[PDB]
Design a protein around this ligand. Sequence first.
Ligand SMILES: Nc1nc2c(ncn2[C@@H]2O[C@H](COP(=O)(O)OP(=O)(O)OP(=O)(O)O)[C@@H](O)[C@H]2O)c(=O)[nH]1
Ligand SMILES: [Mg+2]
Lengths: 142, 10, 13, 570, 585, 415, 163
Amino acid sequence: MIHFILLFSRQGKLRLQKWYITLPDKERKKITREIVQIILSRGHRTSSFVDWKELKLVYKRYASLYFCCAIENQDNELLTLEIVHRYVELLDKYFGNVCELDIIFNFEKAYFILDEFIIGGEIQETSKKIAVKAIEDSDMLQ
Amino acid sequence: KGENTSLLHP
Amino acid sequence: TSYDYCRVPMEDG
Amino acid sequence: EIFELKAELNSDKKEKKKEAVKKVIASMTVGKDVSALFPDVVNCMQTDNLELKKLVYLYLMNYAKSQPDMAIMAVNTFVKDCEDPNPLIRALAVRTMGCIRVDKITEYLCEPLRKCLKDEDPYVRKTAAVCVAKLHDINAQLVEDQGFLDTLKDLISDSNPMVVANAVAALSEIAESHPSSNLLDLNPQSINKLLTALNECTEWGQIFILDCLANYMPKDDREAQSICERVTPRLSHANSAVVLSAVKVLMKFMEMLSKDLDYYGTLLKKLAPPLVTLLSAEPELQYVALRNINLIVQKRPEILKHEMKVFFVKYNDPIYVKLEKLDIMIRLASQANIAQVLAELREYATEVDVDFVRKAVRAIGRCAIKVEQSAERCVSTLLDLIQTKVNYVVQEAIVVIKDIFRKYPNKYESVIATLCENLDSLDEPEARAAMIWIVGEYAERIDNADELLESFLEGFHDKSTQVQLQLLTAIVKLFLKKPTETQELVQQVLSLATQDSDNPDLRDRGYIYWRLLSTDPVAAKEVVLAEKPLISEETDLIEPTLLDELICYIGTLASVYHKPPSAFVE
Amino acid sequence: PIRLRELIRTIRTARTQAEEREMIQKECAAIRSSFREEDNTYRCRNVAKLLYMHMLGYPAHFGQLECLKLIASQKFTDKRIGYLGAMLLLDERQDVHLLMTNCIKNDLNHSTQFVQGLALCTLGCMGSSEMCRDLAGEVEKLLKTSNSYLRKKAALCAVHVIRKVPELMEMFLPATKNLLNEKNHGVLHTSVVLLTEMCERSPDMLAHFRKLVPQLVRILKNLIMSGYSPEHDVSGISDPFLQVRILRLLRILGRNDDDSSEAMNDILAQVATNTETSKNVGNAILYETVLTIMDIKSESGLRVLAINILGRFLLNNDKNIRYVALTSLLKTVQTDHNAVQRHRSTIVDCLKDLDVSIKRRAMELSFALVNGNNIRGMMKELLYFLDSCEPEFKADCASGIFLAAEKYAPSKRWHIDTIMRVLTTAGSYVRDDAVPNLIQLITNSVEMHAYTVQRLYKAILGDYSQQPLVQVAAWCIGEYGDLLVSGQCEEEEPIQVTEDEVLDILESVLISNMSTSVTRGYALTAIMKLSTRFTCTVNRIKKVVSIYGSSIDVELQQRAVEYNALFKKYDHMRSALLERMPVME
Amino acid sequence: SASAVYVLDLKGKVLICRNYRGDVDMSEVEHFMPILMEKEEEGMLSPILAHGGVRFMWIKHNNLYLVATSKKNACVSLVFSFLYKVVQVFSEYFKELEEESIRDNFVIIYELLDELMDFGYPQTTDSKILQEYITQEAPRPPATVTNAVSWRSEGIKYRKNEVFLDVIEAVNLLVSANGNVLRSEIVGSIKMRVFLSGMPELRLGLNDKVLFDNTGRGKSKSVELEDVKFHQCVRLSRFENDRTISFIPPDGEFELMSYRLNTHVKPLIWIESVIEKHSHSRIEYMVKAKSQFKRRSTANNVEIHIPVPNDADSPKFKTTVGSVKWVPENSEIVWSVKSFPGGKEYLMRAHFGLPSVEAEDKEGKPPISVKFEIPYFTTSGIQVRYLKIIEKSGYQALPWVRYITQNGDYQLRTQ
Amino acid sequence: EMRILMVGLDAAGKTTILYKLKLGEIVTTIPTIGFNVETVEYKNISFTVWDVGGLDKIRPLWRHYFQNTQGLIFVVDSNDRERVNEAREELMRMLAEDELRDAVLLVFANKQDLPNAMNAAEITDKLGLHSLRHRNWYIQATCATSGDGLYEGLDWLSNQLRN
Ligand SMILES: Nc1nc2c(ncn2[C@@H]2O[C@H](COP(=O)(O)OP(=O)(O)OP(=O)(O)O)[C@@H](O)[C@H]2O)c(=O)[nH]1
Ligand SMILES: [Mg+2]
């Protein structure tokens, strides 16, 4: 059960956030600043898992953009990184040669891809053609 | 700038 | 500044 | 990438090597490792162009530490440039000489610096006087072996007071490095000279020839007045470091004058307007000025006791000035201006800077501890703050009311009637223990004190240490005051404090209370409900054995930290 | 009204945050003004700009109602931005989120499936303890349906309403009946997630749900035998998201059953051998297979194979795989206790690793690895490690050494020696909650007290600025100073104890400001307990108590008076209440 | 006693650097910005940060941090006055000092950071004298650089001889919520612009209270200058003797003296404001601004700021005189009056809404702070009496003065 | 164009009135937890009706909709003799706020089906509408299941919009 997903850049700016656990706003700005301060001060071969407050935090850098998740500490771990990779491929197939600026400008559609891929914490569409077909049909309705 | 690089190089 | 001056005396004897 | 740069650098045209060295120190500016290109700019150094040689001296200064063995190819060029008819290039070479921090180079540079100290043109002399201190920073015993200090003291007796100011600065730099063997302070006649050289040098040299007067101490009363009457006109200067150093030497030299003479009060009245006017400057000077006034009003409180209104903070002040003016308003509280301070601190607990509001509530507390006339106004203000129902304001105000009640315990029984109904679901343990103390020590005018401590025994085994210990004191005192309705309450709290409790101080106090209660409860009225002696206040004034020392260091890091100059430097 | 892209391009041109706040509040006032006109055309882009302002972390509390005005609209784009703003701006504790209930309930009966998709999306992401009590009767209506796009959303919405309201899963037992024969795999994935939650919450649902084990065994076997699918395929691997969930459902089942344990034997024997171990995805499959093996009462030949898999995992150069192997060995500590222990050199080598996470899992695994046979050897390496940590590792290590030593101590003297070595080497990192455990265990010691107190006294004369050291030491002096100083009522031949610097070191603890005002309570308790335990020198510590009753701390000022009353009035009652404390578990 | 004058940017990387003693390593500035961001989130921010044995004296310019590191017990006020004088020297060579000026003028800025300070000691910082051998466009150093008169280069010849003075007042004020005056002092600053030829010895004359009490004219209007901070140029021993202002002026604009006295007179512009802040609904500002000063004077271009809540919406402004713009950046209304004559009393009514859903955090209450300007008028009543140009050559100059009253921090607190 | 609320007690037929004015049918309606909105267009004015339920946990959230409000419809129930006291308490706790001060009051006496039900006079006597000051209150006997009196109240609402 993915608790939350953060998309932050290299500079520390936050490009996306999605909380599947309902903790209040000042706690969000605390948790976000602490996790951005942890991951940006962490080396390149640091095993891509952080045991942060009973949450095996999973991150995977792809560009100046980072990623982040938070699995419950009884579940699979590498599949969370595979979820992150699948989300990158969905962002690529919807946008087409996906960029950093394609997520900064079109973040509302990044949320729509995420909510056509992850709702409630878990994965709703295991395929990578049916999810992009669903979001292209939902935009086809405009 | 470091942003115009694409993500996963398809 | 669009303000204008006023001349002062020199010696004040 | 660098090879084209070196090839263009080893050319013979002016426009090629000039653009080459500009490209070099442009790459040095952005922070590129240009240290490997050292011995190629040294070849294209001897030019008659002067806009170029500053760049090469810059490269020799920023990259002689990293290339110590390669920098031996510059000494002939500096001792050539220290004989040129242009005085600018001589002083440029001289201030380039001392900053080269290589031990193998300074043994050859002692002769042209010795010549330039005896130069005629005073620009290169005021450069070389500081260069002597540069050389003493590298090798101290080398300068003593060469005997520059006895030549350096002869520029103090020179005219044209800028060389005098730089020489006094360098001598105070070197005499700080010595173990004070052969202290370089001088007779009163040289002090007459420097005081007649104070009115002629630059605005920056006036700081240096006042920082040497922080080492002299006079031996007479007419002498100290005679020099303070010439230091005192420096208090009307624009530069806020000049005024502060003049305040430093006045605060040092007023320790010699006589109070019965009518000059001492004149010096106290001539000192307050500059100390106030320092606070109407730029905020990074206001911080240092406030820590210096904090160091002064603990020493001579007779100066600024009529000036409260200039320490009222503004909203556009930064945090580091607002956190200090509250402590100054603590230091200046007296009978005449309790009303202004309590009407002012009430408007500071409505702000959003939480550390500032906590400091303001503690300032109300220290004002209530400091004077006795206004403790009722302080308790009224704190109860009016508690009735705003802001969480951190209440969690500091309860602790502050505790700190007041421990001082003035007698006749505040009309206060806890508001404190018995005050939303006892408070969170922070530093104020929960304060609430338990206010209940337990005054468990006579609270006719329902037993039924509110029932709420505190719900999670008693895992609150804190201080909260559990204060409950263990207060419930025992409650049973001792009223043994009728509280008979099972003390039994259940001793059963939860001795049997299933494992905190060892809690266990020790629980078994001491259980043995004292089961042994003789009649004696317990005299043991634990004892008439306690008067709680001695903690004098947070700095100790006068230390405070007389830090008068000599005003305007330094010893003054801002309020620490002696050895406890923080490394 | 400007567009979203114009606002983002304007915000990216701001340099200082004290200018970026200005460019936020400029457009924020225009959004507020356009909300006071009750617009219906440009309201989409205004709420989109407001969600952008929230995403940076600026106040967007006023734009909560205008999401609700978009949810109850009739165009689709406004419904999309409305449900997105509902999932961002609103949560359980906002209390304006009760207004979404009617709009979601009308949008679950909507004609187009995509509005029902967004309504299931929002309720799955952020439903509360009160919204889900009135919506689960309509989700099960959307769960019996035939639309394959909405079954996968209704199942995870059911997962969310069972996670928030655990007394509501009983109405899904007649809703989950025979929906595992789905040809589509996303619906099958979400149904396996739903069965995972249903089997995790209540054990009384297991008996109906462990009968359908060979069905999903056949499903997973058909997944593995199907070597390729055009979708679902990540590097030649057939639908790993379904396989990991099926293996997790196999893990949470059969862990105390034998019939289903014999049922799942074949495919677990197969996929542990018939899988690909090149990319990360096959390692994920194999790790979930390992965890499926470790929790169930499997065949004895399977666990040897699984330990061989983990021994392969320990040797990989990928640090991900090392983290997975340390996590997996941390899982199966109790089950198969002895075969884990032969990787001891590899685990201790992970304590020397250059990573925070690897050293943390190696620390936890080494603390779980200590038994009553490797106790004398492994503690020497762990005590060598504790001095050679980062400042963040010493706290958890100082806790774990105490926890492992309280369980599996070979003797009492060496136990106190190790704990004392930890207290001398941790200092300002050992947790203050461990001090009752340390004092409780050294007073559980009945035979060796003088050897403890002499070493504590020799330790705190070295330093006093470690807080838990003197927290232990003041209590130890105050309860056993008679074994510190024995038979020395007057001045005798010079031994190391002197019954005068014993009191002076506690006085120095009191005077020096390296005390957190809880060592001082221990200190005064020690001083007053050295009035009955010491018949050598009394009426001198009475001075130290009597001069202490004016201190600015509250409890110290109470305690000094409550001791001084006994020193001045009830000296015949001082010994009458300083009997030794009884010792509990 | 500085060690390394650094000049940073808002990202923390080094725009330009200049060390003198080497006691601080050049990589120590990399620990500045993480330490500042750590101290920023606990309220212990200070101009003197601490990294072990390296202290960071720093000021904040527009985009620039002028960190001056040190290791020993440095004279701190020396370092800060040095840093603000470095700011003034750079802003006198460069029209503005930003990130675009450092990396484009590194030819002259290393020369200046080598010239102003050697070994940590300021030695020559007068920028106008420094314009004569450190140019962006080299000869011998002028004799003014070494001589006692170190702020006036001899040999300057003009066509006219104009002596301009600007006795500019600045009323500070702090009125509490009760409607009473807490602090009211005037920080005035005579700001000269000297165009003279030769080496003049001016003698400025004021109506000082002490000079008139020692003169014998103690019944006319005399200002009690509670403190005076003259420039470097003023002979301060002669001023301490008999309150005489004798100096040799520099060439160009400078600030001669900065007097500072208290005020038992009424405030000039009074802001009688009331706030009907109904919760969740709206807010009304029935504010008025009366002028307590004389009828003749004319307050130009005043800007009466009034702080509004953070999330206000749909403004309505029923005024009488002077327009209202609403600035939501600063979250305040700017009731700009173009011309505000004395004795008048102008009423203004602002009316916002407020969101019905309540806020999440607190708001804070900044003060009403006007930005007034009154020409030809002094609140202090200081009157310059004479200005005796003394020159060896002998000529008649034309000394001109004008009187401006401005604000300093003219704040009035709210409820 | 006129922002109208429908506050009032639970099981009052306010959603029944809302679906009667828009479509014209009596559909099966659950007790609505959140809110509803429809563009009811009669007497050439688009009366935007912000229909809000009145359950035990929504009555505090009515203050989020008391902004830009131009008229109220406080629907009472006629068959509830016991619930008119809490309806009066809700009405005097709602009208006593600074916001929603210039909106007319239009009470609908819904559910006229029984002799146990009341007329306009007794409901006016029990609610105390005559004790209101600076308010244009008007009670209207309505029948939601048959449309009796609804369009008369909308006509009175349309005339009291302009002045
Ligand atoms: N006799 C009679 N019954 C009515 C009338 N109008 C509505 N009802 C009944 O009242 C019940 C509740 O009304 P609804 O509109 O469905 O729900 P509601 O009153 O809006 O409940 P809330 O949404 O909580 O305010 C319905 O089941 C109807 O049967 C009416 O005019 N006459
Ligand atoms: Mg309804």
